[PDB]
Amino acid sequence: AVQKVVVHPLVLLSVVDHFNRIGKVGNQKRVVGVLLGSWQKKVLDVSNSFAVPFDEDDKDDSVWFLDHDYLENMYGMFKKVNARERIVGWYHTGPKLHKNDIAINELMKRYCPNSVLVIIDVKPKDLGLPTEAYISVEEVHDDGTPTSKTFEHVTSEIGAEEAEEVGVEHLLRDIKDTTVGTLSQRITNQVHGLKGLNSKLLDIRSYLEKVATGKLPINHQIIYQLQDVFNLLPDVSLQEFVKAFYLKTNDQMVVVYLASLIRSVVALHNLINNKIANRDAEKKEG
Amino acid sequence: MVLESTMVCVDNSEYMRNGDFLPTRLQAQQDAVNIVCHSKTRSNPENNVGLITLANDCEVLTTLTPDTGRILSKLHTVQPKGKITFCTGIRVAHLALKHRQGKNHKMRIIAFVGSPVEDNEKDLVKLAKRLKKEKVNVDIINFGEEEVNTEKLTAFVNTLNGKDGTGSHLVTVPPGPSLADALISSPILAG
Amino acid sequence: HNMSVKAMRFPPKSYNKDLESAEERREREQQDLEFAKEM
Amino acid sequence: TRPANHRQLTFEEIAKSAKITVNEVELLVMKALSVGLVKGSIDEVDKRVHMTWVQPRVLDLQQIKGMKDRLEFWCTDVKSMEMLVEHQAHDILT
Amino acid sequence: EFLHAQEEVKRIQSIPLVIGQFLEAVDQNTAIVGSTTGSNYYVRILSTIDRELLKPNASVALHKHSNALVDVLPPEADSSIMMLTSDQKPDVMYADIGGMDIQKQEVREAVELPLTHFELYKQIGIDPPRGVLMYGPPG
Amino acid sequence: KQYEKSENDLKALQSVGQIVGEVLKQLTEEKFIVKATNGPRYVVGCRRQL
Amino acid sequence: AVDTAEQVYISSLALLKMLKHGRAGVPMEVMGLMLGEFVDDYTVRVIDVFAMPQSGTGVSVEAVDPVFQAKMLDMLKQTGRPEMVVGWYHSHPGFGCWLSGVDINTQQSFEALSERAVAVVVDPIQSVKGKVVIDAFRLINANMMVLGHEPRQTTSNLGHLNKPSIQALIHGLNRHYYSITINYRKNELEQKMLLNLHKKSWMEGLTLQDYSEHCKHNESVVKEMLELAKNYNKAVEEEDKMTPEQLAIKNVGKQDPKRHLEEHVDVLMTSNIVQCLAAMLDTVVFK
Numbered sequence A: 001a002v003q004k005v006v007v008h009p010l011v012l013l014s015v016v017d018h019f020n021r022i023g024k025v026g027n028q029k030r031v032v033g034v035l036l037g038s039w040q041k042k043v044l045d046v047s048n049s050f051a052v053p054f055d056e057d058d059k060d061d062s063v064w065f066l067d068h069d070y071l072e073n074m075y076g077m078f079k080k081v082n083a084r085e086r087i088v089g090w091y092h093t094g095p096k097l098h099k100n101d102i103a104i105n106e107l108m109k110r111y112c113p114n115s116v117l118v119i120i121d122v123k124p125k126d127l128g129l130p131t132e133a134y135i136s137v138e139e140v141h142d143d144g145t146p147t148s149k150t151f152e153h154v155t156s157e158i159g160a161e162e163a164e165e166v167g168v169e170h171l172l173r174d175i176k177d178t179t180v181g182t183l184s185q186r187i188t189n190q191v192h193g194l195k196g197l198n199s200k201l202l203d204i205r206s207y208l209e210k211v212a213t214g215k216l217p218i219n220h221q222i223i224y225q226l227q228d229v230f231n232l233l234p235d236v237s238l239q240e241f242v243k244a245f246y247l248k249t250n251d252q253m254v255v256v257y258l259a260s261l262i263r264s265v266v267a268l269h270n271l272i273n274n275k276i277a278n279r280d281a282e283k284k285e286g
Numbered sequence B: 001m002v003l004e005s006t007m008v009c010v011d012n013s014e015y016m017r018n019g020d021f022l023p024t025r026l027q028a029q030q031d032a033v034n035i036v037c038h039s040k041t042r043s044n045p046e047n048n049v050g051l052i053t054l055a056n057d058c059e060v061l062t063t064l065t066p067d068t069g070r071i072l073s074k075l076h077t078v079q080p081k082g083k084i085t086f087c088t089g090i091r092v093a094h095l096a097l098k099h100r101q102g103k104n105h106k107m108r109i110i111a112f113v114g115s116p117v118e119d120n121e122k123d124l125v126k127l128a129k130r131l132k133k134e135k136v137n138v139d140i141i142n143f144g145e146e147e148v149n150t151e152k153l154t155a156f157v158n159t160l161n162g163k164d165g166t167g168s169h170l171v172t173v174p175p176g177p178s179l180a181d182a183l184i185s186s187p188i189l190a191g
Numbered sequence C: 001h002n003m004s005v006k007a008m009r010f011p012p013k014s015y016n017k018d019l020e021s022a023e024e025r026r027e028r029e030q031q032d033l034e035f036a037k038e039m
Numbered sequence D: 001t002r003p004a005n006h007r008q009l010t011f012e013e014i015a016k017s018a019k020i021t022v023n024e025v026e027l028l029v030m031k032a033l034s035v036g037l038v039k040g041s042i043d044e045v046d047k048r049v050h051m052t053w054v055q056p057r058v059l060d061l062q063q064i065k066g067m068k069d070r071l072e073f074w075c076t077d078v079k080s081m082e083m084l085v086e087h088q089a090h091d092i093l094t
Numbered sequence E: 001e002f003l004h005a006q007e008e009v010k011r012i013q014s015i016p017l018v019i020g021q022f023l024e025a026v027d028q029n030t031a032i033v034g035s036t037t038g039s040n041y042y043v044r045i046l047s048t049i050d051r052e053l054l055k056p057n058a059s060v061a062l063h064k065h066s067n068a069l070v071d072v073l074p075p076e077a078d079s080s081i082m083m084l085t086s087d088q089k090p091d092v093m094y095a096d097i098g099g100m101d102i103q104k105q106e107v108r109e110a111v112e113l114p115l116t117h118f119e120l121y122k123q124i125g126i127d128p129p130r131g132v133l134m135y136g137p138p139g
Numbered sequence F: 001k002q003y004e005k006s007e008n009d010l011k012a013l014q015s016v017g018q019i020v021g022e023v024l025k026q027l028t029e030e031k032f033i034v035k036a037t038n039g040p041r042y043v044v045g046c047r048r049q050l
Numbered sequence G: 001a002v003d004t005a006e007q008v009y010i011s012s013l014a015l016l017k018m019l020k021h022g023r024a025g026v027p028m029e030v031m032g033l034m035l036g037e038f039v040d041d042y043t044v045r046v047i048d049v050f051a052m053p054q055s056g057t058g059v060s061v062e063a064v065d066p067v068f069q070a071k072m073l074d075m076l077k078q079t080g081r082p083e084m085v086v087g088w089y090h091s092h093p094g095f096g097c098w099l100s101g102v103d104i105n106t107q108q109s110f111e112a113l114s115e116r117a118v119a120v121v122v123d124p125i126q127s128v129k130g131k132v133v134i135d136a137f138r139l140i141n142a143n144m145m146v147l148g149h150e151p152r153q154t155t156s157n158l159g160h161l162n163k164p165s166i167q168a169l170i171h172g173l174n175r176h177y178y179s180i181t182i183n184y185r186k187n188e189l190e191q192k193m194l195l196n197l198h199k200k201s202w203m204e205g206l207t208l209q210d211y212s213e214h215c216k217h218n219e220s221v222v223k224e225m226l227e228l229a230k231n232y233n234k235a236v237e238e239e240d241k242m243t244p245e246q247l248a249i250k251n252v253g254k255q256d257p258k259r260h261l262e263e264h265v266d267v268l269m270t271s272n273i274v275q276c277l278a279a280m281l282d283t284v285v286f287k
């Protein structure tokens, strides 16, 4: 239903500072808060957020509290200072998908119809993007209990804004791999993207570990996609795909040959522009 | 005035479903809640009163507020039907008591039982010594009908005012459908 | 191409001062800016 | 059963395994394409069909060993090919 | 660091920008414009402008206090837009004019026939007319 | 009420005039180009809600 | 007294709050409140900023409702953690930064509460990347200006490091208020999680980029690159001629083939090589 999301650095830091301001609890706390923003053109947007007062105990871990007085009053304030701004969903700090995050969404679904969640990271280390968002469905299959409230991950990305890029680029001042030439693609996706294939490669290997040892659900709805992958594995070197390849490339290196061929003539013309500069400078200057 | 925050736990379980008490059980304990929040409110303007239940779905129907009109509106057509779950009533009380406005306030809860309980006394003695280690003073007032003589309740309040607590109370239900105001005339006079 | 880079970087020599703008014109800019600030 | 090497079969083999005549198997496989349990093409003159996609079925705890092993050396191709990019492309990015 | 300072200068562009018109340049990287306030000035440039987007009558951008070149503009006029083409073509056919065979075919030669078949005027080279005048009694 | 009627003018003397202009064309979403009934042509931005 | 070595520390979030709320209602002078720990006589560490909604239409600074900041002060008290109000701000939008006569009044209403309150001006237009422009201020007593006496008694080479702007020098600059050198507090906990997340492709370079139109676009550059090279066979030939400064001023009306050429050589080069190598890795990786 909703295509993808847009997340700002303001909300991105604006969870982490709250994790600091409850960071004096020491023992254990998750950061849970209310996510605010709009969505237009079936593109989700996230602009602002805050956090709800919240506690939890491990013994009888089916008890949670969201102060709706704080919710109504503070969102009334945010509506008052910005009527354009509104509710969009929620977020929890999300290390590993806590258990109450199946009916928190049911607790606050009366506010937003597509009451969406956001899982973030407070210990940032990965080779990907540590921002996650699911969506609520209660989809029905064809075996066992039908209507099952399973969250489903819609794709996610960090959105920019012309206002906030001044502050972001100001707060970097650290490293910036611009001059995007023949190098920046090699590292933004050719070095790094293979490691992007490494983790998704290793993930199904980790799921695979139930061979006779792991959890109880065997396959049913996992192996049609895997069987579809191994059926969908590409063509081997026999056909014209080789000769179209060879044939293909062979066309591209022509254009490479022309471009490199003109570049040397350009630099040689600059050398003549240099000779004229130094010669008619030696006898004239002295 | 004196620092507390009154947290009432209402009983919307499925054994609250007759007119044995004269107007309505719901209206009777409802107006009891009204006059005890007049007592706590008019004895202390700082005290706020919100309501929780200990049924299957322990919902915060009203957020903890010094208002009473939302409390009245939710107690209108509250639909007291569902399976009681008392063992999570302790956690859904105390965790909100950690959610309260200030820990300078006295941890005081009133708890309403008008249904048969299926708890273990081991479970409420783990939660009871949990309330000992958390220093929590709850006076439980029984309503409606009950397993006679509060089975596990005397042991619970005993394991609540035990170890120099000795100030917590357990008002049992008299099994006669009378006007409950004189039934609760003792804790409102002296806790 | 690279040899046409390596054997042509000689040129940059001789000339050695790129002045910012001036000194006395900077002082006169401070005086005229001081008069605009006084105005 | 047929691997991804060929997965290409003949109407003689279909006539054997279903023991039905030559002039019915085409009407069978057009029905199979109509249901969409299988996806492939039909050549008539060489009497062979190029089956590409099949309906995904279920399997026991034995085929997951095969998919495990096919996964396993598929990992080290990514390792080995990626290591050329790391080692050789090292001076382009520190 | 040169990439950092490279973007740093363009804060001067910003918003509160007034409009003049480019006239000519004295030298490399210093020029002469005419403000739409009416007066002309001897102004400085901004470095990152492609100078080959200037030509003659360029609409330029001027800083509201320092009064120097800022940015080049896509062209603008208010005298008229461009005859907006939807509710703008007066419903009038060529057949609505009767008895103007000389002048209709003649202005057809004068205007749109060099607009389309330019290579005949160039190829034979008969110097197609720049502007046309038409007159007579009214109506 | 006499302090109220004068209290209208207590803060009512703070509105500042608005230059009457005219839209020429539109460069970008935020880059606009106008000219008043006074003189020169300007480059201008708008409120983000209007 | 002070030593003009005050050194305000702020945050890594409040800058974002200032630019967002200062940018959303930008042509009106929006404002709000500042909220952080007040450390010693020299420094201050303002960790948080919440904004205040306006009073009505009109370019000014409106007023402050202590009902509203009394409540909002307590929302974080009963939810997050207690802090202290230290300063406040407004927004000269595209002006630069100074104190107006209206600004100095509402400042003067705040310094009487706490003597080390802070005036702050954000300018969310003239900032681009390295120029954020804030320059927090505070009043100086005009009584000592009547005394003819110099305040603020410099004991450290820390004050006169930034030269003041000429427009604030036209304004009350040094006769009614002073500047404060500020900086920022940050950590790798934030630096990594904003660097690693801002501009990230996912698997996009592991694609093929419109495989019919790649060679077609390659044609679509080379075709006019021919005639542009004919112009390079035009523009060299007026050397051994008039001086290159005239060959510098004279080339401001018509395009040159040189720079325009070496642009397109780069575009064809990096356009081709990425599609080549990225095309060839998948042959190994996928079967």
Ligand SMILES: Nc1ncnc2c1ncn2[C@@H]1O[C@H](COP(=O)(O)OP(=O)(O)OP(=O)(O)O)[C@@H](O)[C@H]1O
Pocket (backbone or CB within 6 Å): E096, E097, E098, E099, E137, E138, E139
């Ligand atoms: N075929 C025609 N030839 C000449 N006149 C015609 C024809 N058909 C209609 N007319 C009339 O002649 C008039 C021509 O209008 P038009 O405005 O072009 O006149 P004009 O020559 O421009 O005179 P003026 O300059 O005074 O307007 C029209 O009002 C129309 O009524």
Ligand SMILES: [Zn+2]
Pocket (backbone or CB within 6 Å): G029, G090, G091, G092, G098, G099, G100, G103
């Ligand atoms: Zn101001």
